[PDB]
């Protein structure tokens, strides 16, 4: 996340940190963000897993907070199912169907048990989005500049505004590389944005006064670049897909 503030407990308790395992007793490497949509299910971006789409390579952590005491029995999860969208494609600049579902369980086989620091996030009604210009909040451990290589140490959150497709599909923006299964969002002052390492993390907009996973961090030319909003998987157009993989 570029610009914005560092977060605490209960601020994004649906947030999931997704790590890739290293061989040997080497600690895993942070790979992507995610959102707890069900006690057993995390939604994230497919592009995060396309190189190594086997579930054994990942481990998910929940309830991150500076006031949360790490408990591996309840906060660490193996991935028992990793599902990428079957029509995920990489285009010239955009990703298509950039979404993935991770079924998680603890070492004793439980799903996520709610707490002050672990909550699910509600999905939008079908094809329903907050109006353009709405304030949504983004969250992650991604770079704090584009030009940086460093990932931050603690959880960050920021506020971006929804940008209409008409404005986003202007040629000096993204032109025809934005379709309606995507959602653009940016800082009107172009100083805050999500960046490398935020993919799969949430875009939380208020649907009728209720926090809602509207987007999943997917791509963008640069980070916080003028005329270049962050692009997000539009969750409202994937509800059937999602609920077809759960039930």
């Amino acid at each position, epitope marked *: 996340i570029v610009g914005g503030e560092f977060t605490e407990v209960e601020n994004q308790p649906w947030f999931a940190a997704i790590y890739q395992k290293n061989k040997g007793g080497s*600690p*895993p490497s942070f790979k992507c963000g995610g959102s707890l949509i069900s006690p057993c299910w995390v939604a994230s971006a497919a592009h995060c897993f396309i190189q190594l789409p086997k579930k054994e390579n990942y481990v998910v952590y929940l309830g991150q907070s500076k006031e949360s*005491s*790490y*408990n591996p029995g309840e906060m660490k999860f193996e991935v028992e199912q990793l599902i990428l969208h079957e029509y995920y494609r990489e285009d010239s600049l955009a990703y298509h169907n950039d979404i993935a579902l991770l079924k998680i369980r603890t070492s004793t086989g439980q799903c996520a048990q709610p707490s002050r620091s672990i909550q699910t996030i509600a999905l939008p009604p079908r094809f329903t989005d907050a109006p353009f210009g709405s304030d949504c909040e983004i969250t992650g451990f991604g770079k704090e500049s584009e030009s940086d290589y460093l990932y931050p140490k603690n959880l960050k959150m920021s506020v971006v505004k929804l940008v209409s497709h008409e404005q986003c599909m202007q040629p000096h923006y993204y032109g025809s590389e934005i379709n309606y299964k995507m959602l653009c969002a940016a800082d009107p002052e172009w100083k805050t944005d999500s960046c490398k390492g935020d993919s799969g993390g949430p875009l939380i907009c208020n649907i009728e006064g209720r926090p809602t996973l509207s987007g999943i961090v997917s791509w963008g030319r640069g980070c916080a670049e003028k005329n270049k909003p962050g692009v997000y998987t539009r969750v409202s157009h994937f509800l059937d897909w999602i609920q077809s993989h759960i039930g």
Partner: nanobody
Amino acid sequence: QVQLQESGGGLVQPGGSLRLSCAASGFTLGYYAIGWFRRAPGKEREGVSCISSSGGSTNYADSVKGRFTISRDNAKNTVDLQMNSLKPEDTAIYYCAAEWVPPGYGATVQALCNNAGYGMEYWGKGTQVTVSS
């Protein structure tokens, strides 16, 4: 190729002292938080004492406060547990366990230790500590 191995087990008189050591091979133990857990013949596994990777945070079960002392040496790839004023109640199999604590949590290793060690990544096979007359 990851291996944890405890050592130091034996039979000691009540009130006596005993030191355990956990050695690692195949990986760098210094990146890991380490917990000493024990299982008594009748009870289930409980956290005795834990220490964070840098050695800055420790936790002790109430049963052993002021009697047991955990320490570590990340140059020698070990974690020690000094047991003084031993009581018969301490008689158990003592396991060493290692877990990588991700960033973004509290500095404490309290929850790592109070929860009977469920979820700890790596385990040694354990060493026997018997306190008897």
